Structure formats: C-alpha cells, structure tokens
C-alpha cells in the first residue's frame, strides 16, 4: 500500500533505538547503533565474480514467495532485509514477502511493515521456533517456489535469478547463495572465501569446510558453476514448493533453532535430490557469536532434542558416532518419530552410508575397532603434530575443527595415531618430551589409555600422564600423573 521507497524508515526505526548511553549489543547481540545508522536501501559492494555479469535470464522464471521468520529482530535490520529483497529482485519474481512474526515482544515490528507493497504479515500467538514458523509461511505461500531468508540479510545484485534458474530446470535441487558477511560490529558488507562450504563433525554441529585441493582447482575451473554441498549453511535457500511439501516440509517437533539444516540436508540427499551453492547469488548475513533470544526448555536441551530427531531418523547405525561425540544426548527424550520414519519409508531413501560415500566422503569415519577418535582436546587447544614428522615433537594448538594435523585416533592396539605416526614415549623420565615415530604394533612405548572418566591420558604400565606444561619449552611431555590442569585431555569421540 506504500511503495517501499516511500516507507518512513526514520519513523519506524525511531522509537526502538538504543537509548543514549545504553548498550548497543544487548538486545540483538550485534551493534544496533550501527544497524540503525544505515539507510534501508544502503549500497553494498558487488561481490560476485566478474563472469556473473555476463548472464541473461528468461522473463518466465517462476516467481517466489519469500518467507522471513523473526523473533525480536532489530527494526532497522528487518526493514533492510525486506527492502533488499524488493530493491534487488525483479518485482515479477517476488509474488509476496511473508513475514512470520514468531511472537516478538512488540507486534508492531511486523505489523508496521505490512503496509509495504508485497509484504504480508503472519503473527504466531506463541513462540513456535524457526521450523514451525517456516512451515506456517510455506503453507501460506501462493507461489510455486519458496525462498527462505533470515531477518538480518542483505540481498545483492541479481541474487535471485540464478537460484530460480536452477530450481526451474530441476525441482529436486535445493539451492543457496554464497553467504557474504555483514560484520556484527560495524555492519560492513564483505565477502568470505568461496573455497568454504558447509559441513559438520560427528557432534552434528555445522561448520565450514575448506575445499580439498581438487575441489579448489575445479572451482577455479569454473568459478560460476554450482557447487554441490553436503550440508546447507543455514538457513538461506530456495526450494520448489511442491518438492518442499512432498519431501515432508520440516519436522514440526523441532523447536527454536538448530538441527533442521542437518535434517533437511540428509533428507534431500538421501531421498533423491541435491543441495547446491550458487556463486553468482550473493546474500549478506549478520553472523553473531551468541543467540539473542531465549530457548524455551533450555538451549542445550532443545539443540540435543532436535539433533536426536534427525539422527534417529536418518543416520542408521552412524547415529552411534553422534552419541560417541555427545554422550549426554542419550539422556534427552526426543519424542515420537514414527511420522518421520514413515516418510522415509514412503520416499524410498538411500541409507546413511550412501550419503557418506557419495555426498560427504570428506567426513572421517572411525575405524570399527577404534577406542576413541577425533581430536584430543585440552581447553580450547588440541593435540597437534605442528606439521612434524617422525622424530618430531608434538604440541598443542588452538582447535580449528579442520582435521589435518589435529586428527587422531586411539586405536584398538592402544596407540595414539595420526596417519602412520604414533605418540611415542622415547624417554620415560618424567619431564621428557614425547615424539612422533612410526607406529609399531608391539611397541610398549606407544601404548596409552584414557583414565579418570576419560579426562586424562596415561601411558600404559606407568604412572606417567601426557602433560602440556612443557609446551613453551619444546612440546608435550610425560609427567608423573597428578591433579594438574595441564594433564586434562579428552577425545571428541569415545567409542
């Protein structure tokens, strides 16, 4: 009813400003003062590859319904998301923007935006969470294609057409932009490395994976080609509405946040579709370090419950590696999953092993006889080869979750192994540095065991424990076992 350029942003953002002298970060866990300083239609740099500019699209691409859910979003960030969609998308391709107000404190945050051309607002009468909110919006959608965006995004130049083009050609493709970064402190818009894609460790927490050298070379081979990915980097994506419905929408028993990216990614791939990152599509996102809202039930309980529902439906026996990483999750009730199991059966989906082999072969799987596996953690540091080889010392280094020099297993033979190298007690005198040496089956100097509720690592047949107190002076040592912070070590997976 007002065209977006005529929407009064100053009146809208005005009453909800951070008070003079008060904390810019409190409400949103990003700097709202900096968000509020920006125009709703602020220019952002074109981060697309130059080759993206040489593309033309048919006018008959399918229109989309854009579903944005929010709970206590900053007005300036919510408005700028909406305006970026309206400004940067050919209007015929925007059937509607459905804002799902997930029981925000002030209903006017959403209601006032309903006066803008294309924008319709649905308000939940209680907190429903992003999964159920997204389903409500998708159910209300008139278009043939769904687009989901977070409520603190900024769409870039020709972001939409490349996504719609993929899905129009094959409805089983679920497609995402490259996600650019809107800095949570100063709101600068910048690009990250396009050699990163979505992934996860066995704790089922999303992380960014660095592409392999061959994947990177392929990417330089065609920097505009769609990139297959094992895991949607949540939750900015485009999906054919009928395919969304046919595949089972979202699991309605998932709450708040977390797990749903895992669940839909497993379901899409195992059940015959694909996930892509589309480099010529760029959307900025305000990444933050803490959630600004509460999780009814507890953020730890909610995340575990959602994640268990995904694991129990999709992962087959590999769910046991999740429980090895997160043993506390075995205690968290997750509710009835029969409707999802029936869905899996109806759709004739492949086993999780097929997903690992064909979609995410980069995820390292433990050996069937390993005792423990993954990273060996002390605080925020990890056991690390430091790039050393046989005869070299080992150290601690900030955990990066990228595997590599931080990949270990405690083997059936009780060795602590990286590739062909094993932690070796070359000198049993307390205070001595340990060394990497080639693994040898019956070498007593290479045998270790978890002790004290899997919180320390003792050299078998001794009273010597692994100790980082020597890290400054040259590497990790064996030391008389004692009640020392520097002797705490825990494998990420205990099998």
């Amino acid at each position: 009813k007002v065209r977006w350029p005529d929407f009064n942003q100053e009146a809208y953002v005005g009453g909800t400003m951070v008070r003079s002298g008060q904390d810019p970060y409190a409400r949103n866990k990003f700097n709202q003062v900096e968000s509020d300083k920006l125009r709703m239609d602020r220019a952002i740099p074109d981060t697309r590859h130059d080759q993206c500019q040489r593309k033309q699209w048919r006018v008959d691409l399918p229109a989309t319904s854009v579903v944005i859910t929010f709970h206590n979003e900053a007005r300036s960030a919510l408005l700028r998301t909406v305006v970026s969609v309206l400004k940067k998308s050919p209007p015929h391709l925007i059937k509607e923007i459905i804002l799902v107000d997930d029981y925000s404190n002030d209903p006017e945050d959403g209601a006032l935006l309903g006066k803008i051309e294309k924008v319709r607002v649905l308000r939940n009468d209680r907190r429903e969470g992003l999964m159920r909110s997204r389903v409500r919006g998708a159910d209300a959608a008139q278009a043939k294609v769904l687009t989901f965006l977070d409520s603190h995004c900024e769409c870039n130049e020709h972001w939409l057409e490349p996504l719609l083009e993929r899905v129009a050609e094959d409805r089983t493709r679920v497609v995402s932009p490259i996600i650019d970064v809107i800095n949570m402190d100063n709101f600068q818009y910048v690009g990250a490395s396009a050699d990163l894609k979505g992934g996860f460790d066995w704790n089922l927490v999303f992380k960014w994976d660095y592409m392999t050298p061959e994947q990177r070379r392929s990417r330089q081979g065609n920097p505009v080609a769609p990139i297959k990915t094992p895991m949607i980097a949540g939750g900015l994506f485009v999906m054919d509405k009928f395919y969304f419905e046919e595949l089972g929408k979202y699991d309605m028993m998932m709450d708040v946040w977390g797990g749903e990216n895992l669940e839909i990614s497993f379901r899409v791939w195992q059940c015959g579709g694909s996930l892509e990152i589309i480099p010529c599509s760029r959307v900025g996102h305000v990444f933050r370090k803490q959630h600004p809202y509460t999780f009814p039930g507890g953020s730890g309980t909610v995340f575990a419950r959602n994640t268990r529902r995904a694991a129990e439906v999709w992962m087959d026996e590999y769910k046991n590696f999740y429980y090895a990483a997160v043993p506390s999750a075995r205690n968290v009730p997750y509710g009835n999953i029969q409707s999802r199991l029936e869905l899996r059966k109806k759709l004739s989906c492949k086993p999780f092993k097929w997903y690992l082999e064909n979609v995410y072969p980069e995820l390292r799987v433990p050996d069937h006889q390993d005792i423990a596996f993954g990273a060996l953690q002390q605080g925020t540091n990890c056991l690390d080869t430091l790039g050393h080889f046989a005869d070299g010392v080992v150290g601690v280094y900030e955990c990066h979750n990228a595997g590599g020099n931080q990949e270990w297993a405690l083997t059936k033979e009780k060795s602590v192994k990286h590739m062909d190298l094993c932690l070796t007690v070359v000198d049993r005198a307390p205070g001595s540095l340990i060394k990497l040496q080639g693994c040898r089956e019956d070498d007593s100097r290479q045998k270790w065991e978890q002790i004290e509720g899997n919180s320390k690592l003792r050299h078998v047949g001794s009273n010597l424990c692994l100790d980082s107190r020597t890290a400054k002076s040259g590497g990790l040592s064996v030391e008389v076992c004692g009640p020392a912070l520097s002797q705490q070590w825990k494998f990420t997976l205990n099998l």
Binding site: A192, Y210, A233, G234, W257, H285, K289, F303, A402
Partner: peptide, 14 residues
C-alpha cells in the same frame, strides 16, 4: 549452543 559461525577455517595447511 552457538549460532551459525562466520566462514573461516584454519590459517595453516595440514
């Protein structure tokens, strides 16, 4: 429970 992380990775190579 931490939100979606900014896209980064290790600053060294294995």
């Amino acid at each position: 429970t931490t939100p979606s992380p900014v896209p980064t990775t290790s600053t060294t190579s294995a």
